[PDB]
C-alpha cells in the first residue's frame, strides 16, 4: 500500500510527534517506509526518520508492504492527522 501527504506541521516532522509516527508504524506486523525527496528510510527506525529532515511543506510518502499494511497505513494516517504532521 502507499499514500502521499504534505505536510502542514510548522516544525515539519521532528522530535515528539516523529517518536509517535514511528511508534504508531512499530505496531504493525508489515514492513513501512517513510520517503522524502527521493530518499526512502525504514519508517520504524528512528534515527533514518530524523534524518530525513522533513520540513513544513514537504511531500512525503510512506508505503507498507504486510498482512496487515492497509489497517498499517489508515493508522498512520491518523497519528499524522492527530500530530498536526500531515494529510
Known amino acids: 500500500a502507499e499514500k502521499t501527504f504534505k505536510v502542514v506541521?510548522?516544525?515539519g516532522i521532528h522530535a515528539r510527534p516523529a517518536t509517535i509516527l514511528v511508534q504508531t508504524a512499530s505496531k504493525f506486523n508489515s514492513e513501512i517506509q517513510l520517503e522524502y525527496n527521493g530518499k526512502?528510510?525504514?519508517?520504524?527506525?528512528?534515527?533514518?526518520?530524523?534524518?530525513?529532515?522533513i520540513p513544513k511543506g514537504a511531500?512525503?510518502?510512506?508505503?507498507?508492504?504486510?498482512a496487515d499494511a492497509a489497517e498499517?497505513?489508515?493508522?498512520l494516517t491518523d497519528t499524522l492527522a492527530k500530530?498536526?504532521?500531515?494529510?
Open 9 to 11: 506541521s510548522d516544525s
Open 40 to 53: 526512502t528510510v525504514n519508517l520504524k527506525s528512528i534515527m533514518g526518520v530524523m534524518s530525513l529532515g
Open 59 to 66: 511531500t512525503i510518502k510512506i508505503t507498507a508492504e504486510g
Open 72 to 75: 498499517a497505513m489508515a493508522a
Open 83 to 87: 500530530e498536526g504532521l500531515a494529510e
